[PDB]
Amino acid sequence: DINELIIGAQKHTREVAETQLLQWCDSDASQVFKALANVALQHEASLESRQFALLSLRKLITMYWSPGFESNVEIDVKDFIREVLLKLCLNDNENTKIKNGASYCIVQISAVDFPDQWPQLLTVIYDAISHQHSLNAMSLLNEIYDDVVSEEMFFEGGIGLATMEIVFKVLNTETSTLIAKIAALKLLKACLLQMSSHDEASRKSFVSQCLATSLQILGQLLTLNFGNVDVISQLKFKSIIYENLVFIKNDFSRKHFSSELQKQFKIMAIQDLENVTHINPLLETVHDCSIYIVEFLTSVCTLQFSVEEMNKIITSLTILCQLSSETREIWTSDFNTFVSKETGLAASYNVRDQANEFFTSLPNPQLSLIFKVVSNDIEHSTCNYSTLESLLYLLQCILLNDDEITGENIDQSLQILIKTLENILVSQEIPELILARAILTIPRVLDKFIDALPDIKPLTSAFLAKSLNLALKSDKELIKSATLIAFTYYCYFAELDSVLGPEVCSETQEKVIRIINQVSSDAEEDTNGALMEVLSQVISYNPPHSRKEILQAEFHLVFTISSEDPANVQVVVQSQECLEKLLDNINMDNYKNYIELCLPSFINVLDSNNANNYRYSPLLSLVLEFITVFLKKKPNDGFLPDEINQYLFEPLAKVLAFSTEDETLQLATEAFSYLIFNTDTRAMEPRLMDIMKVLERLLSLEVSDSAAMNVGPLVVAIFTRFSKEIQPLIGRILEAVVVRLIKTQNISTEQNLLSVLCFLTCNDPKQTVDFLSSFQIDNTDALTLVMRKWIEAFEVIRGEKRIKENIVALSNLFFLNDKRLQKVVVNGNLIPPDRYVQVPLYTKIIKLFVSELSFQSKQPNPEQLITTGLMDVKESVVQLLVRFFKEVASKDVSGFHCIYETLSDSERKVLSEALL
């Protein structure tokens, strides 16, 4: 049965069984496992079937073992399955796919079962390591550690001390294999991690002693000198030692790593940086090893470095930071790879990155002195085109140290260094990657040394002009891109409109604009975002004295690049600022030309997106934001020109008539409302019947609750600008708001719509009560249902502006003294499936107002932060309430004398105190 039952499942024939069999276990699981387990136990099997048996087992377990998070199996078959798993996994002689397979099941069982359902799991593993010499048990312990050794088991449970003494025993034995010392060192790091997440007093003796023993053992370990016997394991040995050293130095206080211990390891580490580079797949074994050596030197880089120690370091990093020929070819074959790296947007982390962390960490006794060490090495290497890029990059790291560089004859050095960088860009047969590094390194020289170059103004203008000049007559987009990037490094420290001429600055705008236009045709994602950033800095330097064409070129770039990568986060952010700087502080006459330059592109995107039913589309969302940025840049004095309305209206309307996507509806709603609120009324006059159909549909059930909640400001806009002609359509606005409001049960959405209702009752309280007291909803008049829902919402409202607009609205209903309102009843008190004493609307309004006024005049809580809605109300809630009560008291409004005698004494004191 079961063996050839999966001979198939391990391609119609696979699923015959893979659900065939899943069936079985749900029927009887306890001895489909035992059957599955039994096949893994049997050495009489294709390592393939055994291996899949274990990994088929593997997935299986986390279902029926013990929920678990996605579930039936008997208690003594699991004891069997754990013991079979320990047999396979802890035996070094077994096949390393059986071991890992068995190790996978064990690690999942442990997660569910360990504390109380596998008590000896660790004592077995510890005994396997120390008395059965199991190497794989060390590996299982290491994968188990994170997820099953808790903080508490580590320290009081004795697991941390048991581990550390095992670790120490392997590393102090001259006869444990280097492979076993690696396993011990990886356990050591696991232990350091558990000790890094700490505070309780009884632990501090344990931690202090494990750190001290660790530091002495790692010192003796770094003095072994194997042969060429296995250098990939040799280098994985060294890198895990230096990784542990880094971790001790960085996550424990300095009493635990004395500066003299630091000085020993600094020396061993500088030596091993030399050893590792003078042997040198293998290269990323030695490259990744040297990352940890350098990481440690970074971590003790406040120590002093003998001059000779620094030349050692610089010659080793010069070799290590040289670009591999694979990476040179990737960069020269797709320049977007080079942009991705140099803009920091690459996921890589290599020796060059770690060197940058070293050089930008140096304090200033050492930082200035490496400066000439590298500056000499650059002079003694101007024709070695195998080390010069790397040396320039080390220079770049040093210059990125935020600290200043000064020393005995550093001005000498600089005039020398300045005077080989200009020969890089004049030199005509210079390799592409080295020219780019020189281009990107020049601004950082001029930035770091600006206070020590009297010629800084013409120096920069020439260096920059030379670089645009290469870039435009180089065919290499990598060189162009290095220049675009370098241009931003010049802006960082230099205000170009003053350091250059008004005329030259204007001509370097045109020159990076067309460099951008050359790179853009071939640009992928990270480098489109960098083009947008460059463009916005170009836009910054726009001249008052207008220039028709350069503006048109900038916006064309903004729009086409954004159409290329509308989901890239930098494109989205930088293009909106680009647009905000173009229409920043612009007059009405220029506005009229921007309308023709800008809007027809935006309407194309919206036109195209109807094909897609205005479903979510990142360029749609981005172009709607462009539109809103355009509208809101109109001169404060004036209306939107009439052209804006006739360009934008039925495009935006269509979006709102068909889209069902919350972000699209919300961005279009606010653009549309704003267009209605800010164009002349006679321009908008024929559109109102259409604005209504938009509004009715945004309250229909075709759109979500949160789409209904954007309607507020559209209602405002059509009253605020169709005041005369809205009056015969108020009844439809109201029916729309009302049928929606009663169909929703989300309290927050009710409030949003009640807000619109508050606006509508204030505008005409009678017509509201009339409509609502003639309009029928499910057999009864709306009046009762709405008012009850209104009151229930008012009771849990929040926000000063919301409270006021409801107070004003309901105050207007009270002052109606309406025959019909007086007769409706809302819910008062719970009576002991549930019931409530029925309360007249009117006296419930009084009751609620007195409670608000009681709470609101118990004056503030001492501490605070300092010193929405559709209607603007200036009075405090307290002022609104006292002015209301004073007036209904003064004239017996709507039976107030009756209501007021039904009030309690408590309520009644509140009333006459506030009215004192």
Q: Three-state SS across 271-301?
A: HHHHHHHCCCCCHHHHHHHHHHHHHHHHHCC
d(Cα 583, Cα 630) in Å, to the nearest integer? Answer: 7
Domain membership flag for residue 635: no
Could you give the angle at which helices 782-794 and 765-772 cross, rounded to 10 degrees?
120
Q: Kind of pairing, strands 825-831 and 835-840?
A: antiparallel
Distance, CA of 21 to CA of 27 (rounded, Å)? 10
Query: Among the residues of 660-780, which ranges form H helices?
Result: 662-677, 681-684, 688-699, 705-708, 712-721, 723-726, 730-743, 747-763, 765-772
Structural element, H or E, at residue 156: none
∠ at Cα 499 (496, 503), nearest 5°?
75
What sections of 565-617 are H helices per DSSP?
569-582, 588-610
Residue 255's identity, in one-letter code, is K
What's the CA gap between 32 and 765, in Å, rounded? 75
Strand partners of residue 777: 780
How far apart, in whole angstroms, are the C-alpha atoms of residue 678 and residue 146?
62
Q: With H, G, I as helix, E, B as strand and everything else as coil, classify residue 829.
A: strand
List the domain range (segments joined by +) for residue 8.
Answer: 1-117
Q: How far apart are CA 771 and CA 786, in angstroms?
A: 12
Which SS3 state, helix, strand or coil, does residue 530 take?
helix
Distance CA 608, CA 451 (A): 55
Q: Resolution of the deposited coordinates, in angstroms?
A: 2.5
Number of CB atoms found within 10 A of residue 460's CB: 22
List Cβ<8 Å contacts ≥24 apart for 29-33: 29/64, 29/72, 29/73, 30/72, 30/73, 30/74, 30/77, 31/74, 31/77, 32/2, 33/57, 33/60, 33/61, 33/64, 33/73, 33/77, 33/78, 33/81
Q: Please give the structure tokens belonging to residue 579.
A: 């647009």
Single-letter code of the amino acid located at 877: V
135 within some domain: no
Q: Distance between CA 821 and CA 819 in Å, rounded?
A: 6
Instruction: For residue 68, say if its preceding peptide bond is cis, omega within 30 degrees of 0.
Output: yes
Give CA separation, 53 vs 98, 101, 840, in Å.
Answer: 10, 9, 75
Q: Are the beta carbons of 161 and 209 closer than 8 angstroms?
A: no
| Residue 402 tokens, joined | 């935020």
Contact (Cβ atoms closer than 8 angstroms) between residue 433 and residue 391:
no
Nearby residues of 472 by Cβ (< 8 Å), 6 or more positions away: 480, 511, 514, 515, 518
Backbone angle region of 68, left / alpha / beta, with phi > 0 → left and psi within -120 to 50 → alpha: left
User: Could you give the CA distance from residue 562 to residue 788 in angstroms, rounded to a whole number?
Assistant: 50
Residues 353, 359, 364: CA angle, nearest 5 degrees: 165
In a domain, 332, yes or no: no
Both structure tokens of 821 = 């309102």
- Rounded Cα distance between 853 and 809, Å, is 17
- Please check whether residue 89 lies inside any domain of the structure: yes
**Number of domain units in the chain:** 1
In a domain, residue 71? The reply is yes
Residue 101 lies in a domain: yes
Q: What value does the CA radius of gyration of the chain take, rounded to a whole number of Å?
A: 38
Nearest alpha carbon to residue 234 among 244, 245, 246, 222:
222
> SS3 of 873, please?
coil
What is the secondary structure of 167-185 as a DSSP string? HHHHHT-TTS-HHHHHHHH
Which of 381-388's residues contact partners 24+ apart within 8 Å by CB, and which partners?
A: 382/420, 382/423, 385/431, 385/434, 386/322, 387/318, 387/319, 387/322, 388/434
In 3D space, the residue among 359, 355, 255, 344 whose CA is nearest the CA of residue 305 turns out to be 359
Q: Which residue has the tokens 């609104």?
A: 880
Angstrom CA distances, 250 to 243, 247, 283, 296, 739, stand at 11, 5, 28, 9, 65
With beta carbons less than 8 A apart as the criterion, state whether 652 and 668 touch.
yes
Question: Which residues lie below 8 Å from residue 353, measured CB to CB, with a gap of 6+?
Answer: none
Task: Decide if 111 is inside a domain.
Answer: yes
Q: Which two tokens stand for residue 219?
A: 């010192």
Reading the block at residue 149, the tokens are 């050794």
**What is d(CA 60, CA 491) in angstroms, rounded to the nearest whole number?**
60
Distance of alpha carbon 150 from alpha carbon 200, whole angstroms:
15
How many angstroms separate the CA atoms of 721 and 719, rounded?
5
> Dihedral of CA 275/281/284/288: which sign?
negative
Q: How many residues does the chain have?
A: 916
Of the candidates 296, 286, 288, 441, the one whose C-alpha atom is nearest the C-alpha of residue 358 is 296
Q: Which of 877, 894, 712 lies closest to 815, judged by CA?
A: 894
Specify if 912 maps to a domain.
no
Q: Which of the 8 DSSP states describes residue 858?
A: S
User: Distance (Å, rounded) from C-alpha 896 to C-alpha 910?
Assistant: 15
Torsion over CA: 63, 69, 75, 80 (sign): positive
For residues 699 and 392, what is the distance between their CA atoms, to the nearest angstrom? 64
Residues 6+ apart with CB under 8 A from 809: 757, 758, 759, 761, 762
Task: Let me know: does 398 contact 370? Beta carbons within 8 Å.
Answer: yes
Q: Which two tokens stand for residue 257?
A: 């790593």
Experimental method: X-ray
Q: What is the CB neighbour count within 10 angstroms for residue 415? A: 11
DSSP 827: E
* Cα(510)–Cα(550) distance, integer angstroms: 7
Residue 609 to residue 912: CA distance in whole angstroms: 63
Give Cα 797 to chain centroid, integer Å. 33
Structure-block tokens of residue 31:
């001895």
Amino acid in the structure at residue 65 = W
Name the one residue in this structure whose structure tokens are 């159909």.
693
Classify each residue of 345-373 as buried b or exposed e, where b means 16 or more C-beta atoms within 10 Å of its C-beta: eeeeebbbbbbbbbbbbbeeebbbbbbbb
